[PDB]
């Protein structure tokens, strides 16, 4: 956002019984993600790993293994309870990385504060043929 909110521990995690689908040996050997949000009341949400958990009042923090799980929980909280979550990626060493939203507004807005990347000023269909890009290691779209 206006400043990357640094992820901090000692946050009240939601009450949940022990699940079975989550945090394997990769969540420790390689990397894992963590989502934090703010809840205005006490409700019961559905975790993307099994049953349902409740929403503890105040801050909330959950940890997952894949970025898709955190993104799924993010869109569920944004379309069913009207919240504003944010998740990070914790590496093996302990390097926290801000992930969503990077610009901090939302990824579907403009904000005029980001430069476009991976764009082709030509239209699809104007790409050259496979024969032209031979032994060049590159591809028509990459060119």
């Amino acid at each position: 956002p206006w400043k990357q909110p640094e992820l901090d521990p000692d946050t009240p995690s939601p009450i949940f019984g022990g699940s079975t689908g989550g945090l394997l040996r990769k969540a420790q050997v390689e990397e894992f993600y963590v989502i934090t949000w703010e809840s205005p009341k006490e409700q019961i949400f559905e975790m993307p790993t099994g049953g349902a958990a409740i929403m503890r009042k105040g801050p909330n923090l959950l940890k997952f293994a894949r970025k898709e799980q955190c993104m799924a929980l993010t869109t569920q909280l944004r379309s069913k309870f009207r919240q504003t979550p944010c998740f990070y990626r914790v590496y093996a060493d302990g390097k926290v990385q801000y992930l969503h939203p990077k610009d901090g507004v939302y990824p579907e807005k403009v904000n005029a504060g980001r430069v476009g990347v991976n764009q082709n000023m030509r239209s699809i269909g104007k790409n050259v043929d496979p024969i032209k890009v031979k032994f060049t290691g590159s591809a028509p779209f990459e060119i």
Partner: protein, 80 residues
Amino acid sequence: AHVVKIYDTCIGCTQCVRACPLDVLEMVPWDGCKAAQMASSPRTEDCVGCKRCETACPTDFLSVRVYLGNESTRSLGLAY
């Protein structure tokens, strides 16, 4: 990972950014369409390849393309 490309025939409807389930695409400002915004893809390393953006693309042909390539732990969707 996979290589995503956005062509100039984009209309800026912001549907691919809404259909992406891994926050790969974004909307940057542009000066070549009526909406004055074009999609981009900064988090290409997080592309998984489900091709939901191509289904969300309304123009013919698709302005966004997902060319599959090498696979990593993130692009293979592995949780272990």
